Amino acid sequence: SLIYTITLNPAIDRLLFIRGELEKRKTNRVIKTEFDCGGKGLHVSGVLSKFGIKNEALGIAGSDNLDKLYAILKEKHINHDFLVEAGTSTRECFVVLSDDTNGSTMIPEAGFTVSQTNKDNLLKQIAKKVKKEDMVVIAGSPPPHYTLSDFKELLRTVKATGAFLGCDNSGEYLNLAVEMGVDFIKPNEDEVIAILDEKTNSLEENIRTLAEKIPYLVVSLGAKGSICAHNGKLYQVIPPKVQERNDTGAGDVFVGAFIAGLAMNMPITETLKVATGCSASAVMQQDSSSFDLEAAGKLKNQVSIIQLEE
Amino acid sequence: SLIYTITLNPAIDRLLFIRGELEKRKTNRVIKTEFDCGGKGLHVSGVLSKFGIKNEALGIAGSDNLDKLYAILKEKHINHDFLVEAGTSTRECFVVLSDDTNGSTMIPEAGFTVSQTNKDNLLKQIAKKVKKEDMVVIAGSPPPHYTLSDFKELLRTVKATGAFLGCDNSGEYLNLAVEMGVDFIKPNEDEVIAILDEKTNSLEENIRTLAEKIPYLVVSLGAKGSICAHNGKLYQVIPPKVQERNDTGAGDVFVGAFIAGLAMNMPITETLKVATGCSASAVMQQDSSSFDLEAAGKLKNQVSIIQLEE
Ligand SMILES: [K+]
Ligand SMILES: [K+]
């Protein structure tokens, strides 16, 4: 079986290293420039490849900087079968950070216009490639003019294959994934509340209710960890405390590692420890997408899981 | 006669338009991307061309994004005879601004390594092209590894032609231009004080002393205007008050317009009014390099000039 990621709006992440804080309305000299691939689906693929789990990245990239994107992907051991949009470039996201500080400032370009030809080609690729035994992870917002109905077509095309379908999305796109019955989502608490438009039940009751439509539900609670609902059970996941450097993109690492755990047929509790361990390792790294596999192994074994009753 | 500009470290300015303030440690979505040419010498050439004054831009650009740079230059009506560094790209400066706010945040890449071959080629171009009746304006810092001695060779090569030589530079590079006797510099007050390492005389006395080595000396006083020393006279230049949008690059506009005034054989006082008028117009524009020629004409005629006695 295989794992496919779908990155509707990939990016070349340009990391701009400066001295000290970013000062607005001032000149902030770049000490060094580094390049990474962006778009959540690509981060997920990078994580899976780090686990040695076979996967293929799908999405739509621009022809004009395609050589640059492919060289980065090769560097990150990401196998892909991207569709190419002629006469455009994959967007850049500018990531302003410092060796001297914590966190990063994200300045992303929006993305290009995907042709109906390529929208259709994506749907066809899914039909031709994806089997019932595979997993498909759609991660990241669509580019401008890739509409809600486009996204509906996409979800249903995956669903018709019988494959496991995970969605790491936000806003209206996340609302759709719930309505249409995907297998996995990773909303935060406010997203759970917004999806249900429910203001007076406990968060735990909201999660148990949302679990009636989502078989693998992980709710992020920021620093406090996660609550996962699976098979009528509810798990509180508490991460180890770590020296935090930058939590940007740690959510994508969690997704990659969680899917990895599932693909390795790990029990849900072990999968949650693996995902949380990798995510905690990522928070310790200054960049957006990376994590330390050996440190993640140790942090996995410092995660506590409590089953919540009733 | 001709005017040559020298941009040792040109840039493609990428203007990143966002909503509201730039928030560090947060995502700042780009609404639109615009492109401009950067490097002070190129700004100067753009201004001269806007005046209809024939000029040629010299410098060293990277081969890898040369088509992009040339298309921008064509768009800005900048004639050029750039040297090309193989296997590299002209640096980008990222300029974060908003329609909703004032000012801009500059995030410049440092520039590439110029080969000795191209350093030598620049010196040769100067020898072959530049005549006693021409003007040469060196504006902007050299790229990494273009040294103080490299810059000395550059200044002396220009001086040997007999041409008028203006330098818009900072730090050690500005110190050199004073020692070696250029015709024009535009230091700020602190730079004047640093050049002379003189802490106890009046600023006016510092300027009159520096004027013994610089025939066209303009000292910027920020919002208060300028003091210019020429031919044993001292002029206080007071700009009109304007609705300010972004003063970034207004100094380059002043230089272009000041040189323009000189090339049009305008009396010094008229030249100062023109330069200040154009600079005030530039402060009213949101971007880095532009100004309104018609508004600048009006603002020129609102500038007051007082001759300071003794
Ligand atoms: K990180
Ligand atoms: K401006």
mmCIF file with all atom_site columns, N, CA and C in Angstrom, chain B residues 201-234:
data_model
loop_
_atom_site.group_PDB
_atom_site.id
_atom_site.type_symbol
_atom_site.label_atom_id
_atom_site.label_alt_id
_atom_site.label_comp_id
_atom_site.label_asym_id
_atom_site.label_entity_id
_atom_site.label_seq_id
_atom_site.pdbx_PDB_ins_code
_atom_site.Cartn_x
_atom_site.Cartn_y
_atom_site.Cartn_z
_atom_site.occupancy
_atom_site.B_iso_or_equiv
_atom_site.pdbx_formal_charge
_atom_site.auth_seq_id
_atom_site.auth_comp_id
_atom_site.auth_asym_id
_atom_site.auth_atom_id
_atom_site.pdbx_PDB_model_num
ATOM 1   N N  . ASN B 1 201 ? 33.520 71.667 17.881 1.00 0.00 ? 201 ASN B N  1
ATOM 2   C CA . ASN B 1 201 ? 33.140 72.806 17.030 1.00 0.00 ? 201 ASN B CA 1
ATOM 3   C C  . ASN B 1 201 ? 31.661 72.719 16.669 1.00 0.00 ? 201 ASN B C  1
ATOM 4   N N  . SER B 1 202 ? 31.067 73.844 16.275 1.00 0.00 ? 202 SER B N  1
ATOM 5   C CA . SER B 1 202 ? 29.700 73.846 15.746 1.00 0.00 ? 202 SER B CA 1
ATOM 6   C C  . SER B 1 202 ? 29.606 72.946 14.507 1.00 0.00 ? 202 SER B C  1
ATOM 7   N N  . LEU B 1 203 ? 28.409 72.426 14.227 1.00 0.00 ? 203 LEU B N  1
ATOM 8   C CA . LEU B 1 203 ? 28.226 71.650 13.010 1.00 0.00 ? 203 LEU B CA 1
ATOM 9   C C  . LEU B 1 203 ? 28.592 72.486 11.790 1.00 0.00 ? 203 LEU B C  1
ATOM 10  N N  . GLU B 1 204 ? 28.206 73.761 11.799 1.00 0.00 ? 204 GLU B N  1
ATOM 11  C CA . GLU B 1 204 ? 28.509 74.645 10.670 1.00 0.00 ? 204 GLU B CA 1
ATOM 12  C C  . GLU B 1 204 ? 30.012 74.778 10.421 1.00 0.00 ? 204 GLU B C  1
ATOM 13  N N  . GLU B 1 205 ? 30.790 74.840 11.496 1.00 0.00 ? 205 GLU B N  1
ATOM 14  C CA . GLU B 1 205 ? 32.232 74.897 11.366 1.00 0.00 ? 205 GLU B CA 1
ATOM 15  C C  . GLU B 1 205 ? 32.776 73.585 10.794 1.00 0.00 ? 205 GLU B C  1
ATOM 16  N N  . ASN B 1 206 ? 32.211 72.444 11.216 1.00 0.00 ? 206 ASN B N  1
ATOM 17  C CA . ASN B 1 206 ? 32.586 71.140 10.646 1.00 0.00 ? 206 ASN B CA 1
ATOM 18  C C  . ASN B 1 206 ? 32.342 71.121 9.132  1.00 0.00 ? 206 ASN B C  1
ATOM 19  N N  . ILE B 1 207 ? 31.175 71.613 8.729  1.00 0.00 ? 207 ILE B N  1
ATOM 20  C CA . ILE B 1 207 ? 30.797 71.603 7.317  1.00 0.00 ? 207 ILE B CA 1
ATOM 21  C C  . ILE B 1 207 ? 31.742 72.502 6.496  1.00 0.00 ? 207 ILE B C  1
ATOM 22  N N  . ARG B 1 208 ? 32.036 73.703 6.999  1.00 0.00 ? 208 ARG B N  1
ATOM 23  C CA . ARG B 1 208 ? 32.971 74.612 6.315  1.00 0.00 ? 208 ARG B CA 1
ATOM 24  C C  . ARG B 1 208 ? 34.379 74.019 6.181  1.00 0.00 ? 208 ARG B C  1
ATOM 25  N N  . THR B 1 209 ? 34.776 73.222 7.166  1.00 0.00 ? 209 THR B N  1
ATOM 26  C CA . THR B 1 209 ? 36.073 72.549 7.157  1.00 0.00 ? 209 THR B CA 1
ATOM 27  C C  . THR B 1 209 ? 36.079 71.406 6.148  1.00 0.00 ? 209 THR B C  1
ATOM 28  N N  . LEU B 1 210 ? 35.034 70.578 6.176  1.00 0.00 ? 210 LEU B N  1
ATOM 29  C CA . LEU B 1 210 ? 34.901 69.480 5.221  1.00 0.00 ? 210 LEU B CA 1
ATOM 30  C C  . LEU B 1 210 ? 34.821 70.015 3.779  1.00 0.00 ? 210 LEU B C  1
ATOM 31  N N  . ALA B 1 211 ? 34.216 71.191 3.621  1.00 0.00 ? 211 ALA B N  1
ATOM 32  C CA . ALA B 1 211 ? 34.104 71.876 2.320  1.00 0.00 ? 211 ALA B CA 1
ATOM 33  C C  . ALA B 1 211 ? 35.455 72.221 1.692  1.00 0.00 ? 211 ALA B C  1
ATOM 34  N N  . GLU B 1 212 ? 36.513 72.297 2.501  1.00 0.00 ? 212 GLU B N  1
ATOM 35  C CA . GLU B 1 212 ? 37.856 72.508 1.957  1.00 0.00 ? 212 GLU B CA 1
ATOM 36  C C  . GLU B 1 212 ? 38.342 71.347 1.083  1.00 0.00 ? 212 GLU B C  1
ATOM 37  N N  . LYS B 1 213 ? 37.722 70.171 1.232  1.00 0.00 ? 213 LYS B N  1
ATOM 38  C CA . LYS B 1 213 ? 38.057 68.977 0.441  1.00 0.00 ? 213 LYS B CA 1
ATOM 39  C C  . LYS B 1 213 ? 36.949 68.541 -0.534 1.00 0.00 ? 213 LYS B C  1
ATOM 40  N N  . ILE B 1 214 ? 35.710 68.972 -0.290 1.00 0.00 ? 214 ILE B N  1
ATOM 41  C CA . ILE B 1 214 ? 34.565 68.588 -1.125 1.00 0.00 ? 214 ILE B CA 1
ATOM 42  C C  . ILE B 1 214 ? 33.940 69.845 -1.750 1.00 0.00 ? 214 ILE B C  1
ATOM 43  N N  . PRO B 1 215 ? 33.995 69.984 -3.093 1.00 0.00 ? 215 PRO B N  1
ATOM 44  C CA . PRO B 1 215 ? 33.409 71.186 -3.733 1.00 0.00 ? 215 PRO B CA 1
ATOM 45  C C  . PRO B 1 215 ? 31.873 71.260 -3.685 1.00 0.00 ? 215 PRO B C  1
ATOM 46  N N  . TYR B 1 216 ? 31.198 70.110 -3.742 1.00 0.00 ? 216 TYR B N  1
ATOM 47  C CA . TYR B 1 216 ? 29.732 70.067 -3.659 1.00 0.00 ? 216 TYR B CA 1
ATOM 48  C C  . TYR B 1 216 ? 29.350 69.219 -2.468 1.00 0.00 ? 216 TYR B C  1
ATOM 49  N N  . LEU B 1 217 ? 29.225 69.866 -1.316 1.00 0.00 ? 217 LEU B N  1
ATOM 50  C CA . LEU B 1 217 ? 28.934 69.171 -0.077 1.00 0.00 ? 217 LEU B CA 1
ATOM 51  C C  . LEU B 1 217 ? 27.489 69.413 0.365  1.00 0.00 ? 217 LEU B C  1
ATOM 52  N N  . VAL B 1 218 ? 26.700 68.343 0.451  1.00 0.00 ? 218 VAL B N  1
ATOM 53  C CA . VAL B 1 218 ? 25.340 68.427 0.972  1.00 0.00 ? 218 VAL B CA 1
ATOM 54  C C  . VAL B 1 218 ? 25.212 67.582 2.234  1.00 0.00 ? 218 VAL B C  1
ATOM 55  N N  . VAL B 1 219 ? 24.873 68.241 3.337  1.00 0.00 ? 219 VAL B N  1
ATOM 56  C CA . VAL B 1 219 ? 24.700 67.548 4.598  1.00 0.00 ? 219 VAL B CA 1
ATOM 57  C C  . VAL B 1 219 ? 23.212 67.431 4.888  1.00 0.00 ? 219 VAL B C  1
ATOM 58  N N  . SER B 1 220 ? 22.715 66.201 4.993  1.00 0.00 ? 220 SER B N  1
ATOM 59  C CA . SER B 1 220 ? 21.301 65.985 5.306  1.00 0.00 ? 220 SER B CA 1
ATOM 60  C C  . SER B 1 220 ? 21.036 66.148 6.791  1.00 0.00 ? 220 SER B C  1
ATOM 61  N N  . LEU B 1 221 ? 19.966 66.869 7.105  1.00 0.00 ? 221 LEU B N  1
ATOM 62  C CA . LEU B 1 221 ? 19.579 67.109 8.486  1.00 0.00 ? 221 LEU B CA 1
ATOM 63  C C  . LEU B 1 221 ? 18.227 66.452 8.786  1.00 0.00 ? 221 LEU B C  1
ATOM 64  N N  . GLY B 1 222 ? 17.935 65.351 8.099  1.00 0.00 ? 222 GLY B N  1
ATOM 65  C CA . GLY B 1 222 ? 16.670 64.628 8.271  1.00 0.00 ? 222 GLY B CA 1
ATOM 66  C C  . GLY B 1 222 ? 15.496 65.481 7.828  1.00 0.00 ? 222 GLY B C  1
ATOM 67  N N  . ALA B 1 223 ? 14.530 65.665 8.728  1.00 0.00 ? 223 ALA B N  1
ATOM 68  C CA . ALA B 1 223 ? 13.310 66.432 8.438  1.00 0.00 ? 223 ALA B CA 1
ATOM 69  C C  . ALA B 1 223 ? 13.569 67.926 8.301  1.00 0.00 ? 223 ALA B C  1
ATOM 70  N N  . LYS B 1 224 ? 14.624 68.399 8.959  1.00 0.00 ? 224 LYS B N  1
ATOM 71  C CA . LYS B 1 224 ? 14.932 69.817 8.994  1.00 0.00 ? 224 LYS B CA 1
ATOM 72  C C  . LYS B 1 224 ? 15.452 70.356 7.650  1.00 0.00 ? 224 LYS B C  1
ATOM 73  N N  . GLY B 1 225 ? 15.785 69.457 6.729  1.00 0.00 ? 225 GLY B N  1
ATOM 74  C CA . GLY B 1 225 ? 16.300 69.847 5.413  1.00 0.00 ? 225 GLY B CA 1
ATOM 75  C C  . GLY B 1 225 ? 17.773 69.493 5.221  1.00 0.00 ? 225 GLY B C  1
ATOM 76  N N  . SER B 1 226 ? 18.548 70.462 4.724  1.00 0.00 ? 226 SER B N  1
ATOM 77  C CA . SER B 1 226 ? 19.971 70.280 4.398  1.00 0.00 ? 226 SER B CA 1
ATOM 78  C C  . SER B 1 226 ? 20.782 71.533 4.649  1.00 0.00 ? 226 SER B C  1
ATOM 79  N N  . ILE B 1 227 ? 22.098 71.348 4.770  1.00 0.00 ? 227 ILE B N  1
ATOM 80  C CA . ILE B 1 227 ? 23.042 72.461 4.632  1.00 0.00 ? 227 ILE B CA 1
ATOM 81  C C  . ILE B 1 227 ? 24.008 72.121 3.503  1.00 0.00 ? 227 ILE B C  1
ATOM 82  N N  . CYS B 1 228 ? 24.139 73.028 2.540  1.00 0.00 ? 228 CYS B N  1
ATOM 83  C CA . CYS B 1 228 ? 25.047 72.799 1.422  1.00 0.00 ? 228 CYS B CA 1
ATOM 84  C C  . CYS B 1 228 ? 26.181 73.809 1.429  1.00 0.00 ? 228 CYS B C  1
ATOM 85  N N  . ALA B 1 229 ? 27.396 73.303 1.244  1.00 0.00 ? 229 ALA B N  1
ATOM 86  C CA . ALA B 1 229 ? 28.573 74.154 1.099  1.00 0.00 ? 229 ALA B CA 1
ATOM 87  C C  . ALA B 1 229 ? 29.068 74.079 -0.343 1.00 0.00 ? 229 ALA B C  1
ATOM 88  N N  . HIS B 1 230 ? 29.195 75.250 -0.963 1.00 0.00 ? 230 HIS B N  1
ATOM 89  C CA . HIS B 1 230 ? 29.688 75.360 -2.333 1.00 0.00 ? 230 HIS B CA 1
ATOM 90  C C  . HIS B 1 230 ? 30.307 76.740 -2.556 1.00 0.00 ? 230 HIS B C  1
ATOM 91  N N  . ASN B 1 231 ? 31.526 76.744 -3.090 1.00 0.00 ? 231 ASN B N  1
ATOM 92  C CA . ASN B 1 231 ? 32.229 77.967 -3.495 1.00 0.00 ? 231 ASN B CA 1
ATOM 93  C C  . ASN B 1 231 ? 32.392 78.965 -2.335 1.00 0.00 ? 231 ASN B C  1
ATOM 94  N N  . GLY B 1 232 ? 32.657 78.440 -1.143 1.00 0.00 ? 232 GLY B N  1
ATOM 95  C CA . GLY B 1 232 ? 32.896 79.280 0.035  1.00 0.00 ? 232 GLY B CA 1
ATOM 96  C C  . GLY B 1 232 ? 31.628 79.844 0.657  1.00 0.00 ? 232 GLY B C  1
ATOM 97  N N  . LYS B 1 233 ? 30.476 79.451 0.115  1.00 0.00 ? 233 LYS B N  1
ATOM 98  C CA . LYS B 1 233 ? 29.181 79.849 0.661  1.00 0.00 ? 233 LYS B CA 1
ATOM 99  C C  . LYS B 1 233 ? 28.504 78.671 1.360  1.00 0.00 ? 233 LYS B C  1
ATOM 100 N N  . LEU B 1 234 ? 27.612 78.986 2.296  1.00 0.00 ? 234 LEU B N  1
ATOM 101 C CA . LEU B 1 234 ? 26.888 77.975 3.053  1.00 0.00 ? 234 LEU B CA 1
ATOM 102 C C  . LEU B 1 234 ? 25.392 78.243 2.976  1.00 0.00 ? 234 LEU B C  1
#
